[PDB]
Structure 1
Amino acid sequence: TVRIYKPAKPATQSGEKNTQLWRMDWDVLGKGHRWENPLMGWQSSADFMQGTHLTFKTKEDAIAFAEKQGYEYFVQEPNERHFRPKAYANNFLYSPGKLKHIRTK
């Protein structure tokens, strides 16, 4: 099974460059993805698809390629931000009552 999804924006950065395209990725199997090589401690693999991913402009393209090759696939739709307007002046609203929170710039 391949996964078809839009990669989420990393929580560590504000750049959204890697969220623009659709990614096709192979799910890791229960056995054979990784194991420790006894000699060096390196990480061996039996999964020839482990380092392979495909990039698509639209998910219909990704689905079309997956149907054509015969991959089982699962489509994960992207979570979208819920818009809410933001205003700098809201940091300084008048409080008719108990302050309820003390702001620090």
Structure 2
Amino acid sequence: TQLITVDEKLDITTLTGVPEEHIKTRKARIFVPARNNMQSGVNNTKKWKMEFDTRERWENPLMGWASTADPLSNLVLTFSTKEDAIAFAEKNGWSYDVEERKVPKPKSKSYGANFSWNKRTRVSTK
């Protein structure tokens, strides 16, 4: 009730219990996931996924499976703004690589321009 409050940083990584091997060695990456190019629809955009980089996946020598010694291998954290992403990553301690968002560039096309006269943009097929 109107207590101590001091304007500083945060150090939660000494509390969330994941060991320090995984703290300092593993590396995070924040990116908007690209449109999977075969479909053309960008509802899969608008989010900022935090992922971890991949590591070794050998052969399971009895069945032909891919085991791993990576508990963090299948994290994903879908966010809504780059600021809160970076704030969370620095709040929880490990390092992070920021790739920036890329919209499709707006264009200038028209069907009448596909029916040109002395301009070379000509439909040529139909």
State the TM-score, normalized to the length of structure 1: 0.85
CA distance in 2 between partners of 1:73 and 1:90 (Å) = 46
Task: Give the number of equivalent residue pairs.
Answer: 100
CA RMSD, 1 decimal: 1.9
Structure 1 gaps of 5+ residues are none
Alignment correspondent of 2:46: 20
Task: Kindly report which structure 2 residues correspond to 1:1-105, keeping only aligned pairs within 5 A, or say none.
Answer: 1-29=27-55, 33-95=56-118, 103-105=124-126
CA distance in 2 between partners of 1:58 and 1:102 (Å) = 42
Shift of 1:79: 2.3
Q: Is the contact made by 1:26 and 1:50 (CA closer than 8 Å) also made in structure 2? A: yes
Percent identity, aligned pairs only, is 48
Which deviates more, 74-83 or 47-56? 74-83
State the TM-score, normalized to the length of structure 2: 0.72
Deviations 1:69-91 (A, max 9, x none): 00100000022322222111111
Q: Which has the higher contact order (CA 8 A, sep 6+)?
A: 1
Write out the 4+ residue segments of structure 1 that deviate beyond 6 Å after TM superposition.
99-102
